[PDB]
């Protein structure tokens, strides 16, 4: 790859600069370069990797939704035929999204997950694996849709099992995993009751453990608990 000649530490430095400049494509390319050096990632480095790709794929998802809406409207009764261009451009954006997801899943499989022994690293990588299968599922319409959904579920489930065994209920990684797995249930698996149950149980168990935390840890945990509450409000 194009980052093969750049020092690991330089790639990390540039990823931070890219973040400050809101150059998330660049940020993601620098972090991909850093992962491909083959060394495990620190906590900070894992955050940089996730932030970069979240931002890139987030922009793609937002664009895909805009295009999909236009396309769905075009296929309604009385809509004038405008040719193949809307489908073609939605397909272009979709293909680019799928590519970014495949890239991230490829980094996780080669070889971030298998070298991740600590609970925080393993849960975080498995959460990411669930997230990027979930983004694949959002655009899936073919023979493999069920398998893509199940791959998301499986990664989230392994992450959940480790998190419950090894992390306190207020751990931000545990919380963020639960938040996203709950959204998976609601939006992807057509299981809104499971989504609500998971969000509520996660919130309540975290509430009960806040007493153990420093002020700074309290702030971090409560921020994510509020997101769980926000979703519960949306859903009930």
């Amino acid at each position: 790859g194009a980052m093969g000649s750049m020092e690991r530490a330089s790639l990390i430095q540039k990823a931070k600069l890219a973040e400050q400049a809101e150059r998330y494509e660049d940020m993601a390319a620098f972090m991909k370069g850093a992962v491909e050096k083959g060394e495990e990632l620190s906590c900070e480095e894992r955050n940089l990797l996730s932030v970069a790709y979240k931002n890139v794929v987030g922009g793609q998802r937002a664009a895909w939704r805009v295009l999909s809406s236009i396309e769905q409207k075009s296929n309604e009764e009385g809509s004038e035929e405008k040719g193949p261009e809307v489908r073609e451009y939605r397909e272009k954006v979709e293909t680019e999204l799928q590519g970014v997801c495949d890239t991230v899943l490829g980094l996780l499989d080669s070889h971030l997950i298998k070298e991740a022994g600590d609970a925080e690293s393993r849960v975080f990588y498995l959460k990411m694996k669930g997230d990027y299968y979930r983004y694949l599922a959002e655009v899936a319409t073919g023979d493999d849709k069920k398998r893509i959904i199940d791959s998301a579920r499986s990664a989230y489930q392994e992450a959940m099992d480790i998190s419950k065994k090894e992390m306190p209920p207020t751990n931000p990684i545990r919380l963020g995993l639960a938040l996203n797995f709950s959204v998976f249930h609601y939006e992807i698996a057509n299981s809104p009751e499971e989504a609500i149950s998971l969000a509520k149980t996660t919130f309540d168990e975290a509430m009960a453990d806040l007493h153990t935390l420093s002020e700074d840890s309290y702030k971090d945990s409560t921020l994510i608990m509020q997101l769980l509450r926000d979703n519960l409000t949306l859903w009930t």
């Binding site: 997230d131 963020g176 938040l179 996203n180 959204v183 609601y186 939006e187 994510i224 997101l227 926000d230 979703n231 949306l234 859903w235």
Partner: peptide
Amino acid sequence: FPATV
């Protein structure tokens, strides 16, 4: 859309 992190 719902919140994810």
